[PDB]
């Protein structure tokens, strides 16, 4: 809790309500929390994500009023929306590209957290809550891609049940449980649709905890120096209230984001998608040029980088007496990329919060930013030479950054002195 000032009922109606349900007080204390006044444009992505989550749910609920979860009608029901429902063509492209906007946001939102050390204490809860949001989003966003029931949709669904099917021993049981039969069939589409509706509400529930988490501790800032809490007047020099200073700033950036985003949806709605999903599902034929969505490609590369001849894989195979094969190792590597990223509060031992004043950390971060982009780029490329080795170096550096580099970094760091106060950084600039 940062030193704010309580809410005082002014009118009579406010007194009537405040003595029964202090909803106006909770809104005031929340929306007027002191926020550092030095936040740059990288602190907008939280509000954009909030809008996006409303956008997907609002448009998504509308799409459920015309979609039919059945293999014989699913692909057809989408073209019904596109052609006959008034404005239905815009709503699908909005819901489709909206997911892409919803996913460029999180990565910029996440890389902001990684750069400025917003995962280090006391903000572990905000990070872990965020990671749960990320996992729900990835599973949620995929199952939406299953619903159109195109060629890309059908064989993607076959993969995910195989990913849980790759676990030793219990995998085959789980794969049948996920599929509802020997293969992807009507039982699989019907259940994936139910979860695609459910999980966004679970995501909304997490966002409430996500919102509560940073309000209790306070927003991080580019310098990494915490707000002064010794007096109300000292905090006002380092901070301004969230409303109206930063709400309008985030809303301003939102209009610019929406300005760019609506031009995408209005003029190239299919550039961010794959044309193969406009072909009806064929259980007897897989496309030659599979490419998942751009927000799944970095995890697509990790799944393919660890083939059976990789040196690291062969070591694990003998130690486990053959249990950990290339298939299971690839699944562990893919989910392992989350685990190393989820555990980053306990791998970075440097006591300096902001990475602006960590010179050695900056290099590995920007390499990681390049690494994540490079990982995305190879996902569209064929597995042949030289792309096979490139994805392994990129995959290796990912685990090296979190499991090897960041623990080592905390000891040998030579940090730079941060400013004495947020006001010094704000006023000097």
């Amino acid at each position: 809790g940062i030193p704010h000032d309580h809410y005082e009922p002014r009118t009579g109606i406010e007194k009537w309500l405040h003595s029964r349900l202090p909803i106006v007080a909770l809104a005031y204390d929340t929306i007027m929390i002191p926020t550092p006044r030095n936040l740059n444009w990288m602190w907008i992505w939280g509000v954009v994500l909030a809008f996006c989550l409303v956008l997907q749910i609002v448009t998504g609920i509308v799409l459920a009023m015309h979609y039919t979860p059945h293999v014989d009608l699913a692909f057809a029901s989408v073209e019904h929306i596109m052609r006959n429902v008034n404005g239905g063509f815009m709503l699908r492209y909005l819901h489709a590209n909206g997911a892409s906007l919803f996913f460029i946001a999180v990565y910029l939102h996440i890389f902001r957290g990684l750069y400025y050390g917003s995962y280090k204490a006391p903000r572990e809860v905000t990070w872990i809550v965020g990671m749960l949001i990320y996992l729900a989003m990835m599973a949620t966003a995929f199952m939406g891609y299953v619903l159109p029931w195109g060629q890309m949709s059908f064989w993607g669904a076959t993969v995910i049940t195989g990913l849980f099917g790759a676990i030793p021993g219990i995998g085959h049981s789980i794969q049948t449980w996920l599929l509802g039969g020997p293969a992807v069939d009507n039982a699989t589409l019907n259940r994936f649709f139910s979860l695609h509706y459910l999980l966004p509400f679970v995501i909304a529930a997490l966002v409430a905890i996500h919102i509560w988490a940073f309000h209790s501790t306070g927003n991080n800032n580019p310098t990494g120096v915490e707000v002064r809490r010794t007096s109300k007047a000292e905090a006002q020099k380092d901070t301004v209230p969230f409303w109206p200073y930063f709400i309008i700033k985030d809303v301003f950036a939102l209009a610019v984001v929406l300005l760019v985003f609506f031009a995408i949806v209005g003029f190239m709605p299919n550039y961010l998608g794959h044309p193969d999903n406009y072909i009806e599902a064929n259980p007897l034929s897989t496309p030659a040029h599979i490419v998942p969505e751009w927000y799944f490609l970095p995890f697509y590369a990790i799944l393919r980088a660890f083939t059976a001849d990789v040196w690291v894989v062969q070591i694990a195979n003998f130690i486990s007496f053959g249990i950990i094969d290339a298939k299971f190792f690839g699944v562990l590597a893919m989910f392992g990329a989350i685990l190393v990223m989820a555990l980053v509060p306990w791998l970075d031992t440097s006591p300096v919060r902001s990475g602006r004043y960590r010179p050695m950390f900056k290099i590995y971060f920007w390499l990681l930013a390049a690494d994540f982009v490079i990982l995305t780029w190879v996902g569209a490329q064929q597995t042949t030479f030289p792309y096979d080795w490139i994805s392994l170096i990129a995959s290796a550096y990912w685990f090296a950054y979190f499991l090897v580099i960041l623990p080592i970094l905390g000891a040998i760091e030579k940090p730079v002195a941060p400013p004495a106060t947020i006001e010094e950084d704000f006023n000097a600039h």
Binding site: W155, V159, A166, G180, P182, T286, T307, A326
Partner: protein, 179 residues
């Protein structure tokens, strides 16, 4: 006193068992239903399949490959030795599970002309591309990049095992019985 603290354990267990007995039905519902469980065998008419042409047929939701292999494909399979193969198991339901992954153990006839196998990549269940594709004159999987030889055996890629061979047999000269 055994009469005292015991009650504050059995009461939780009854609630826990009640929760467990109410949660297990919610999980088991996702298992396959009766309409899919009762699928059965099929019969394929291979009367007009010349050499080099592959015939794909649906069975239990997945594709089954039926390729009449060419002159070059058959010897290419028989040239590979058991030590050169990633997987030495034939993965065949007709012959025993321990059979070796020789080219003569992957086909139905001693001439090795008719190759019948599941069109289900053992990595994650995609359909490998047929004809003569990949680096071994066989099948290439476009999902993650698995290369098979002309006999349908895995040689390179994430796939651990060879493509499985269903319970198949020729009931007459021109008809195959799948399952």
């Amino acid at each position: 006193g055994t009469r005292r603290d015991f009650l504050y354990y059995a009461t939780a267990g009854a609630g826990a068992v009640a929760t467990g007995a109410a949660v297990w039905p919610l999980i088991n519902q996702m298992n396959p239903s009766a309409d899919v469980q009762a699928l059965a065998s099929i019969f394929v008419d291979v009367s007009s399949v010349e050499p080099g042409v592959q015939l794909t047929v649906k069975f239990l939701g997945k594709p089954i490959f039926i390729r009449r292999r060419t002159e070059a494909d058959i010897e290419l399979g028989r040239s590979v030795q058991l030590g050169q193969l990633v997987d030495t198991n034939a993965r065949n339901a007709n012959i025993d599970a321990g059979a070796e992954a020789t080219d003569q153990n992957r086909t139905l006839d001693e001439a090795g002309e008719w190759l019948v196998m599941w069109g289900v990549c053992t990595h994650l269940g995609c359909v490998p591309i047929g004809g003569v594709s990949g680096d071994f004159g066989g099948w290439f999987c476009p999902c993650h990049g698995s290369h098979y030889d002309s006999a349908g055996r895995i040689r390179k890629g994430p796939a651990p095992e060879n493509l499985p061979i269903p319970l198949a047999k020729f009931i007459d000269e021109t008809t195959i019985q799948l399952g």
